[PDB]
Design a protein around this motif. Structure first.
Motif, PDB file in Angstrom:
ATOM      1  N   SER B 197      -6.066  40.532 -40.807  1.00  0.00           N
ATOM      2  CA  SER B 197      -6.934  40.490 -39.812  1.00  0.00           C
ATOM      3  C   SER B 197      -7.389  39.075 -39.269  1.00  0.00           C
ATOM      4  CB  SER B 197      -8.271  41.332 -40.175  1.00  0.00           C
ATOM      5  OG  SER B 197      -8.118  42.906 -40.632  1.00  0.00           O
ATOM      6  N   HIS B 201      -7.195  38.039 -35.477  1.00  0.00           N
ATOM      7  CA  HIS B 201      -8.236  37.003 -34.863  1.00  0.00           C
ATOM      8  C   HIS B 201      -7.640  35.827 -34.400  1.00  0.00           C
ATOM      9  CE1 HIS B 201     -12.220  39.063 -35.491  1.00  0.00           C
ATOM     10  NE2 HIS B 201     -11.693  39.547 -36.587  1.00  0.00           N
ATOM     11  N   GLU B 218      -9.682  43.840 -27.853  1.00  0.00           N
ATOM     12  CA  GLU B 218      -9.560  45.053 -28.840  1.00  0.00           C
ATOM     13  C   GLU B 218      -7.991  45.530 -29.053  1.00  0.00           C
ATOM     14  OE1 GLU B 218     -11.938  48.509 -27.726  1.00  0.00           O
ATOM     15  OE2 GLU B 218     -11.848  49.372 -29.830  1.00  0.00           O
ATOM     16  N   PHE B 221      -5.841  43.195 -30.782  1.00  0.00           N
ATOM     17  CA  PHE B 221      -6.168  42.966 -32.370  1.00  0.00           C
ATOM     18  C   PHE B 221      -5.385  44.236 -33.004  1.00  0.00           C
ATOM     19  CE2 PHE B 221      -8.928  41.647 -36.007  1.00  0.00           C
ATOM     20  CZ  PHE B 221      -8.770  42.749 -36.554  1.00  0.00           C
ATOM     21  N   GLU B 222      -5.784  45.185 -32.494  1.00  0.00           N
ATOM     22  CA  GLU B 222      -5.277  46.640 -33.236  1.00  0.00           C
ATOM     23  C   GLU B 222      -3.862  46.553 -33.282  1.00  0.00           C
ATOM     24  OE1 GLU B 222      -7.734  49.899 -31.699  1.00  0.00           O
ATOM     25  OE2 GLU B 222      -9.201  49.775 -33.336  1.00  0.00           O
ATOM     26  N   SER B 234      -8.757  50.913 -37.967  1.00  0.00           N
ATOM     27  CA  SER B 234      -9.643  49.774 -38.180  1.00  0.00           C
ATOM     28  C   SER B 234     -10.580  50.171 -38.984  1.00  0.00           C
ATOM     29  CB  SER B 234     -10.391  49.447 -36.763  1.00  0.00           C
ATOM     30  OG  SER B 234      -9.237  48.924 -35.842  1.00  0.00           O
ATOM     31  N   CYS B 238     -14.096  48.251 -33.071  1.00  0.00           N
ATOM     32  CA  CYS B 238     -13.998  46.979 -32.839  1.00  0.00           C
ATOM     33  C   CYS B 238     -15.291  46.675 -31.925  1.00  0.00           C
ATOM     34  CB  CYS B 238     -12.881  46.361 -32.059  1.00  0.00           C
ATOM     35  SG  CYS B 238     -11.377  46.448 -33.193  1.00  0.00           S
ATOM     36  N   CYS B 240     -16.427  43.935 -29.575  1.00  0.00           N
ATOM     37  CA  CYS B 240     -16.006  42.815 -28.674  1.00  0.00           C
ATOM     38  C   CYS B 240     -16.897  42.476 -27.516  1.00  0.00           C
ATOM     39  CB  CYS B 240     -14.684  43.167 -27.956  1.00  0.00           C
ATOM     40  SG  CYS B 240     -13.076  43.443 -29.125  1.00  0.00           S
ATOM     41  N   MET B 272     -14.117  42.375 -35.726  1.00  0.00           N
ATOM     42  CA  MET B 272     -13.071  43.296 -35.981  1.00  0.00           C
ATOM     43  C   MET B 272     -12.394  43.382 -37.426  1.00  0.00           C
ATOM     44  SD  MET B 272     -11.273  42.908 -32.156  1.00  0.00           S
ATOM     45  CE  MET B 272     -11.018  41.236 -32.261  1.00  0.00           C
TER      46      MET B 272
END
Ligand code: PRO
Ligand code: PRO
Ligand SMILES: [Mn+2]
Ligand SMILES: [Mn+2]
Ligand SMILES: [Mn+2]
Ligand SMILES: [Mn+2]
Ligand SMILES: [O-]
Ligand SMILES: [O-]
Lengths: 484, 478
Positions: B197, B201, B218, B221-222, B234, B238, B240, B272
């Protein structure tokens, strides 16, 4: 008027789409002799949920009938429609002060009226009072059986509904029938979900490399759909089957979670479709992991391409969908015979239901707000109790406005093959020595989304389909989509 | 022993992890005076669900207590543990033949025994027979209140359970207390979820550009977490938030779905955290959209950085978590005064609960299989009825093995500011001439995941945190 939009290149969806659906529903109900004057349709929207007993929120996706009628994205709402006037009223939660801290702005009722283009907006805690004031003859609520899940759709309820006369039988068949036939505005959204999902399938085909995990392509597909398409949800869990897993029809669930390493010589069968504003797409691409069809892979694949195009070419109003399923069966059997997997009279193969050994699922299904959309088996339309056909999600005749998947496939499924070899009525057709080479092959499925027109169909999907097109697409070097 | 693994560079999690959890639970129960010989723990796994009445399947994620005990990813299972011997039995669904066609191979009981390293596997429909044969004194089932949702965790049930003696009060506080204290094997997984994670980020910080939609980040990130980390889920939706949205604590839900365009001058607040094999992570990074902190942004950010580090430096066994919350409050108030937003005596601001105007949430919470993990308020631990503190998700004293978030923040929330300005007990502290400049600022939150250790803490999270580091990373520094 207002439109739903997630910016960038995403589709603007007019809220007039939903107004038209409400109007179409009322028009159908007005013609139903059983419907009393002064009736009010009452629908209850979905509510927010958590994981089990925890406070971990689950991302909210609206209930499909409520979405069809109102397009409302917020949880905790109700929606009513006066049948005689078509007047719509949305009921929204009255939120506490602390919502402004934790969740976001507390919008006025006027905000929601403007956002959703409804005639009136009230608070949910007032629904009983508001409805009473309108002096309805009867409240029409939604209860019926989904013919794919077998689940009973649950009726709207609110505090004080017991004081009203409620009918829960009339509405379900009528609203289901409206959903079966897509408006031009709905078709624009389905064209879009197919466009984005098609693009994402192409990106996946370009990206596949031997040695990758299946789920890496699932991740890429969903990322393309969300970041480029604004598709926060998939229409269903991505099915990313490589090798023998392509014979597993709904592979990819928690029990078989797309965790196989793609190997040289695998066929890939990727069935994936993003959802935009609760409208589905449903597309399957089949291709060699290494970008080059073997002789055997080409033969099986082109068999399925043949039945695909034959069915699409025959589809038009009045055609009986089970006849299309049978057409695909007959074509698969002809091709498997040409390959030498089968020998004998294809007429006799068909009579023995041998097609269902290789294609155990239905040829295709209605598609709309739900990937397996409603209305496939209304009253008077019976399921056919034969191998293959019994899995068809509709036995209706085609009419303009219907949206269907066309998804023939051929699979090599050990327990079905073993069953057929044990049965003297089918075994005689099967050449064991040839079939043995195809154990572990997996399968091929080619899935297009189409709409029935006055004279034929319109194809929504746009992915490479001939062997040459697929091999060319996979060899393409565009760094069109390169995350980090 | 066998391990859970999603290949590539993902973490191998030994099934011995869950065996140790069962052993720890039995050992705790054997010391409990309410527990008699011949007791059997009975847990019921989650089941598959669909969207409403449709046949659209929802992706299955295991119930957390069941996961903690068994690590089982399949729906429809039960699990029992003989308290006296620690013997484990997994009950799995007896599948129809057609499962072979649609869902995949019909695995044998022996496959599952080997996969999960349990002592026995049986079919679910045999649970009444199997338990009857063992002649238990009492079945210990799971029922209790989650103190974050308020929801009641519902008991295992099966056809014929009524013929057994059942107790549903003993287990919950005990298995909760086991979950509060992470084993070294569990910490290995939480280090991993924090590693991935954190990496994600950093990719987001590198990728953000003015003009993007929040949901694009989002999505990225995923995608990092799944494709590189094997994190299919997740830990939570998220958050954001850009610009004014960064003042909305759980922004990003269906009602406010990360659909704002990021503007030049915005602060971003991205909360997130990927989940791996049902273990959480929970990280927040705050940074300027355009990669350059303004003086105002630097001041608010470094105020939160100061409280983050003061708290992390002060955390150790024996520390009372509400004191850490108050520490963060005092630091925010001092720094807001150093910025000219506030004036007067900081002692007086604290006495007036002014800190809660700027940080209306709790300083941090237990983290584990659930992002808001269980055990914050066991019997006897009381929620403190004051602004800010009443939102704390635990009021416990720190002890080794606890895993907590440390997430101070400062936000400019209009209805809270306006309340304070209407309150004579608070209004005089506020300097409108300066504060007006920060209306619409949004907010900053800096969220780290840490483990309480013998000597203090172990920091799990690894993201850029100083202004210099952030600006460096946003300009792509390795
Ligand atoms: O379930 C169905 O109807 C289609 C056929 C296999 C994949 N999905
Ligand atoms: O809910 C909580 O405890 C923290 C505070 C804001 C983000 N999540
Ligand atoms: Mn499909
Ligand atoms: Mn389909
Ligand atoms: Mn967080
Ligand atoms: Mn947190
Ligand atoms: O499908
Ligand atoms: O958080």
């Amino acid at each position: 008027g207002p439109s739903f939009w997630l910016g960038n290149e995403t589709l603007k969806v007019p809220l007039a789409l939903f107004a038209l659906n409400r109007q179409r529903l009322c028009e159908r109900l007005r013609k139903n002799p059983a419907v009393q004057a002064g009736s009010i349709v009452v629908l209850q929207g979905g509510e927010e949920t958590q994981r089990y007993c925890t406070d971990t929120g689950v991302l909210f996706r609206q209930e499909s009938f409520f979405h069809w009628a109102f397009g409302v994205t917020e949880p905790g709402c109700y929606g009513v429609i006066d049948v005689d006037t078509g007047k719509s009223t949305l009921f929204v939660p009255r939120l506490p002060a602390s919502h402004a801290t934790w969740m976001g702005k507390i919008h006025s009722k006027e905000h929601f009226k403007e956002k959703y283009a409804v005639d009136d907006v009230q608070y949910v805690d007032e629904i009983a009072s508001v409805l009473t004031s309108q002096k309805p003859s009867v409240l029409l609520t939604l209860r019926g059986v989904n013919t794919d899940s077998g689940s009973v759709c649950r009726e709207a309820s609110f505090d004080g509904i017991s004081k009203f006369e409620v009918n829960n039988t009339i509405l379900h068949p009528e609203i289901v029938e409206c959903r079966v036939f897509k408006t031009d505005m709905e078709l624009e959204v389905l064209r879009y979900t197919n466009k984005i999902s098609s693009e994402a399938h192409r990106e996946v085909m370009k990206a596949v490399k031997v040695g990758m995990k299946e789920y890496e392509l699932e991740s890429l597909f969903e990322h393309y759909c969300y970041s480029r398409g604004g598709m926060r949800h998939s229409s269903y869990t991505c099915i990313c089957g490589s090798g023998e897993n392509s014979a597993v029809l709904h592979y990819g669930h928690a029990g078989a979670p797309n965790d196989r390493t793609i190997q040289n010589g695998d066929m890939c069968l990727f069935d994936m479709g993003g959802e935009y504003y609760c409208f589905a797409s449903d597309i399957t691409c089949s291709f060699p992991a290494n970008g080059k069809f073997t002789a055997d892979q080409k033969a099986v694949y082109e068999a399925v391409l043949r039945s695909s195009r034959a069915v699409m070419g025959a589809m038009k109003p009045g055609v009986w969908w089970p006849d299309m399923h049978r057409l695909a069966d007959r074509i698969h059997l002809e091709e498997l015979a040409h390959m030498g997997i089968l020998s004998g009279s294809v007429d006799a193969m068909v009579q023995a239901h041998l097609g269902a050994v290789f294609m155990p699922h239905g040829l295709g299904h209605f598609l709309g707000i739900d990937v397996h959309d409603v209305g496939g088996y209304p009253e008077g339309v019976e399921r056919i109790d034969e191998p293959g056909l019994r899995s068809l999600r509709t036995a209706r005749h085609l009419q303009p406005g219907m949206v269907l998947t066309v998804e023939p496939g051929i699979y090599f499924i050990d327990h079905l093959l073993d069953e057929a070899l044990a049965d003297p009525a089918r075994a005689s057709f099967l050449n064991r020595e040839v079939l043995q080479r195809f154990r572990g092959f997996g399968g091929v499925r080619i899935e297009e989304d189409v709409v029935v027109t006055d004279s034929g169909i319109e194809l929504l999907t746009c992915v490479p389909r001939t062997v040459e097109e697929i091999e060319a697409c996979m060899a393409g070097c565009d760094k069109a989509f390169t995350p980090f």
